[PDB]
Amino acid sequence: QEKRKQISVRGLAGVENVTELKKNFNRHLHFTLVKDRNVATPRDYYFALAHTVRDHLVGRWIRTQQHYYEKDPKRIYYLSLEFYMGRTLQNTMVNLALENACDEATYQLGLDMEELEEIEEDAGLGNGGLGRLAACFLDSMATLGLAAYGYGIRYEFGIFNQKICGGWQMEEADDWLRYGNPWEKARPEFTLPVHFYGRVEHTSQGAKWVDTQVVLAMPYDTPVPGYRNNVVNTMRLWSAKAPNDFVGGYIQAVLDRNLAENISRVLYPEGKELRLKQEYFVVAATLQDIIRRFKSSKTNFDAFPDKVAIQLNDTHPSLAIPELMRVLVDLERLDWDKAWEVTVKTCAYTNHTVIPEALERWPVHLLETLLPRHLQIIYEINQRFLNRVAAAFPGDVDRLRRMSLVEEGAVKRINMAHLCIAGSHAVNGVARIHSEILKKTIFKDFYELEPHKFQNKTNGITPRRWLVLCNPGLAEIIAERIGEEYISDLDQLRKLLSYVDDEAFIRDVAKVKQENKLKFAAYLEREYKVHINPNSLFDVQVKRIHEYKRQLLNCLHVITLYNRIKKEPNKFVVPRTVMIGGKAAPGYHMAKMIIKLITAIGDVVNHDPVVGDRLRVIFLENYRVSLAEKVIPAADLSEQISTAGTEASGTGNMKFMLNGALTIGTMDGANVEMAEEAGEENFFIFGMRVEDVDRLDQRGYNAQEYYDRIPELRQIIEQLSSGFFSPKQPDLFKDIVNMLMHHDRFKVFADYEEYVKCQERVSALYKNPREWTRMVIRNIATSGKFSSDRTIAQYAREIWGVEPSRQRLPAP
Amino acid sequence: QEKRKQISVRGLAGVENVTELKKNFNRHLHFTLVKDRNVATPRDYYFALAHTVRDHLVGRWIRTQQHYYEKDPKRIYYLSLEFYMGRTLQNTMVNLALENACDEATYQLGLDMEELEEIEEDAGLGNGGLGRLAACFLDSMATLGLAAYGYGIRYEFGIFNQKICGGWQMEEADDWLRYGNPWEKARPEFTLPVHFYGRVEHTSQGAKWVDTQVVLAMPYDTPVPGYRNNVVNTMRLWSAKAPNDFVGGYIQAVLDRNLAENISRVLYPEGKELRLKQEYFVVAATLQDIIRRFKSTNFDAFPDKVAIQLNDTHPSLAIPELMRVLVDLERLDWDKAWEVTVKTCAYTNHTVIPEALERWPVHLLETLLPRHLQIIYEINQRFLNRVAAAFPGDVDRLRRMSLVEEGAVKRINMAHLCIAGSHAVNGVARIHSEILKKTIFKDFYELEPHKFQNKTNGITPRRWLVLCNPGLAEIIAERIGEEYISDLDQLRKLLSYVDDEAFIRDVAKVKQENKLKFAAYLEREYKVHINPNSLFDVQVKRIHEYKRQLLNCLHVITLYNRIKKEPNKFVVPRTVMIGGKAAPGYHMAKMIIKLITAIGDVVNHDPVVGDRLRVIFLENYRVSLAEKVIPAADLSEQISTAGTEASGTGNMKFMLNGALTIGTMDGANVEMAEEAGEENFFIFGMRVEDVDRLDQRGYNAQEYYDRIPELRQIIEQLSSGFFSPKQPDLFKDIVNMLMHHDRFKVFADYEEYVKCQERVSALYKNPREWTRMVIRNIATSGKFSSDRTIAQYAREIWGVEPSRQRLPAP
Ligand SMILES: O=c1[nH]cnc2c1ncn2[C@@H]1O[C@H](COP(=O)(O)O)[C@@H](O)[C@H]1O
Ligand SMILES: O=c1[nH]cnc2c1ncn2[C@@H]1O[C@H](COP(=O)(O)O)[C@@H](O)[C@H]1O
- The angle, 0 to 180 degrees and rounded to 10, between the axes of the packed helices B334-344 and B370-390 is 90
- Which residues, including other chains, have CB under 8 Å from residue A193's CB and lie 6 or more apart? A214, A215, A216, A217
Cβ within 8 Å of A, B 150-189: 157, 171, 173, 175, 178-180, 185-186, 188-189
- 10 Å Cβ neighbour count for A271? 13
Instruction: Tell me which chain A residues have a C-beta less than 8 angstroms from the C-beta of B173.
Output: 244-246
Technique behind the model: X-ray
DSSP B737-806: HHHH--TT-HHHHHHHHHHHHHHHHHHHTSHHHHHHHHHHHHHT-GGGBHHHHHHHHIIIII--------
Instruction: Kindly give the distance from the C-alpha atom of residue B65 to the centroid of ligand 2, in angstroms, as a whole number.
Output: 6
The residue type found at B131 is: G
- Which residues, including other chains, have CB under 8 Å from residue B728's CB and lie 6 or more apart? B719, B720, B721
Question: Exposed, middle or buried: residue B619 (CB in 10 Å: 0-12, 13-18, 19+)?
Answer: middle
- SS3 letters for A424-491? CCEEEECCHHHHHHHHHHHCHHHHHHCHHHEEECCCCECCHHHHHHCCHHHHHHHHHHHCCHHHHCHH
Q: What is the rounded CA–CA span in Å between residue B555 and residue B711?
A: 9
Percentages of chain B per state (helix, strand, coil), in multiples of 5: 50, 15, 35
Sign of CA dihedral A596, A598, A603, A604: positive
Residues with beta carbon inside 6 Å of ligand 2?
A: A 35-36, 38-39; B 62, 65-66, 69, 293
SS3 B546: coil
Sign of CA dihedral A734, A740, A741, A745: positive
- 10 Å Cβ neighbour count for B67? 15
Q: What is the rounded CA–CA span in Å between residue A288 and residue A327?
A: 9
Element (H, E) at A615: strand A615-620
B88 annotated active-site: no
> Which domains does chain A carry?
8-460+788-807 (3.40.50.2000), 461-787 (3.40.50.2000)
Rg of the Cα atoms in chain A: 28
Which ligand lies nearest to the CA atom of residue B70 in the structure? 2
Residue B9 contacts A, CB cutoff 8 Å: yes
Among A8, A23, A34, A175, most B C-beta atoms within 10 A, so best to mutate, is A34
Q: Which residue from B174, B142, B169 is spatially nearest to B158, judged by alpha carbons?
A: B174
Q: Are B800 and B74 in contact (CB under 8 A)?
A: yes
Across the interface, of A55, A58, A108, the residue whose CB is closest to B6 is A108
- Which residues, including other chains, have CB under 8 Å from residue B205's CB and lie 6 or more apart? none
Q: What is the rounded CA–CA span in Å between residue A283 and residue A316?
A: 9
- SS3 letters for A507-533? HHHHHHHHHHHHHHHHHHHHHHCCCCC
Q: Are A126 and A84 in contact (CB under 8 A)?
A: yes
Sign of CA dihedral B723, B725, B727, B729: positive
DSSP B190-234: G-EEEEES-EEEE-SS-EEEES-EEEEEEEEEEEEE-SSS--EEE
The residue type found at A173 is: A
Q: Are A791 and A140 in contact (CB under 8 A)?
A: yes
Cis peptide before B481 (omega within 30 of 0): no
Cα B641 to the chain's mean position, in Å?
A: 21
Side-by-side strand order, sheet with A662-665 = A615-620, A576-581, A537-542, A637-640, A662-665, A684-685
Question: Exposed, middle or buried: residue A203 (CB in 10 Å: 0-12, 13-18, 19+)?
Answer: exposed
Q: What is the rounded CA–CA span in Å between residue A335 and residue A61?
A: 38
Q: What does the angle CA A772 – CA A774 – CA A780 come to, to the nearest 5 degrees? A: 105
From the candidates B542, B590, B628, B732, which is the catalytic residue?
Answer: B542
Q: What is the DSSP letter of B31?
A: I
- 10 Å Cβ neighbour count for B10? 10
SS3 A589: helix
Q: What is the rounded CA–CA span in Å between residue B630 and residue B662?
A: 15
Cβ contact A173–B108 (<8 Å): no
Beta bridge partners of B426: B348, B453
The residue type found at A296 is: S
Q: Are A125 and A157 in contact (CB under 8 A)?
A: no
Across the interface, of B41, B173, B185, the residue whose CB is closest to A246 is B173
Backbone angles phi, psi at A109, to 5 degrees: -85, -10
Cβ contact B258–A254 (<8 Å): yes
Q: What is the rounded CA–CA span in Å between residue B187 and residue A127?
A: 30
**Which residue out of A5, A12, A60, A66 has the highest number of ligand 1 atoms within 8 Å of its CB and is therefore the one to mutate?**
A66
Beta bridge partners of B538: B577, B636
Q: Are B351 and B358 in contact (CB under 8 A)?
A: no
Q: What is the rounded CA–CA span in Å between residue A171 and residue A160?
A: 6
Residue B165 in contact with ligand 1 by CB distance below 6 A: no
Instruction: Tell me which chain B residues have a C-beta less than 8 angstroms from the C-beta of A1.
Output: 110
Q: What is each CA distance from B569 to B563, B564, B608, B759, in whole angstroms? A: 7, 10, 12, 17
SS3 A312: strand
Beta pairing, strands B635-638 & B660-663 = parallel
DSSP A145-190: T--EEEEEE--SS-S-EEEEETTEEEEE---TTTT--TT-EE-GGG
Which ligand lies nearest to the CA atom of residue B39 in the structure? 1
DSSP A640-704: E-PPTTS-S--SHHHHHHHTT-EEEE-S-TTHHHHHHHH-GGGSEE-S--HHHHHHHHHH---SH
Q: What is the rounded CA–CA span in Å between residue B389 and residue B387?
A: 5
End-to-end Cα, chain A, rounded Å: 24
Cβ contact A7–B258 (<8 Å): no
SS3 A790: helix
Q: What is each CA distance from A528 to A205, A598, B801, in whole angstroms? A: 67, 17, 57
Q: What is the DSSP letter of B123?
A: P
Q: Are A230 and A399 in contact (CB under 8 A)?
A: no
SS3 A415: strand
Phi-psi region of A72 (alpha: psi -120 to 50; beta: other; left: phi over 0): left
Q: What is each CA distance from A74 to A68, A78, A306, A804, in whole angstroms? A: 9, 13, 6, 12
Q: Compute the nearest-CA separation of A426 from chain B (Å).
A: 35
Q: What is the rounded CA–CA span in Å between residue B219 and residue B265?
A: 14
Element (H, E) at B539: strand B535-540
Beta pairing, strands B345-348 & B424-427 = parallel
Question: Exposed, middle or buried: residue B605 (CB in 10 Å: 0-12, 13-18, 19+)?
Answer: exposed
Q: Which residue from A638, A642, A673 is spatially nearest to A431, judged by alpha carbons?
A: A673
Backbone angles phi, psi at B507, to 5 degrees: -60, -50
Instruction: Tell me which chain A residues have a C-beta less than 8 angstroms from the C-beta of B28.
Output: none
Q: Are B609 and B603 in contact (CB under 8 A)?
A: yes
Residue B38 in contact with ligand 1 by CB distance below 6 A: yes
Q: Report the binding-site residues of A.
A: 36, 69, 292-298
Cβ contact A188–B179 (<8 Å): yes
- Beta strands of B279-417 (E only): which ranges? 306-311, 345-348, 359-361, 404-406, 410-413
Q: What is each CA distance from A35 to A45, A47, B187, in whole angstroms? A: 10, 11, 11
